[PDB]
Amino acid sequence: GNYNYRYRLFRKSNLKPFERDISTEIYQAGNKPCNGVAGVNCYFPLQSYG
Amino acid sequence: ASVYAWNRKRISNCVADYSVLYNFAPFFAFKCYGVSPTKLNDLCFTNVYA
């Protein structure tokens, strides 16, 4: 598994044409989330292809 | 029921709210394939088996 290429799986809304963002914050969990931890819906935004 | 005797059921014809889950438990294992958990409550389905 070549764990070098990733891709944003979660975000908030759609993006405008040719709009690039790199932020890798921890996605929300409805309530105040589990910043930097796991839980109900604590989903890292990036996912590797492998 | 046991592993080799899972309790199949059908649940249709109902106004389904997928947010009663989060009040249950720490939800050790919760991952969805083919559909994001955040945008589930809006999307619609033919027949949902559990």
What is the nearest CA distance from B35 to chain A, expressed in angstroms?
A: 11
Cβ within 8 Å of residue A20, ≥6 positions away: none
Buried/exposed A24-37: b ≥16 CB within 10 Å, e otherwise: eebbbbeeebeeee
Cβ within 8 Å of residue B37, ≥6 positions away: A41, B18, B30
In A, which residues are within 8 Å of B38 by CB distance?
Answer: 10, 41
Distances (CA, A) of A19 to A8, A14, A15: 13, 10, 6
Confirm if A36 and A3 have CB atoms less than 8 A apart.
Answer: no
Cβ within 8 Å of residue A22, ≥6 positions away: none
Resolution value in angstroms: 3.2
The minimal CB distance from B27 to the residues A10, A30, A40 is found for A40
C-alpha span between B28 and A9 (Å, rounded)? 21
By what method was this entry solved?
cryo-EM
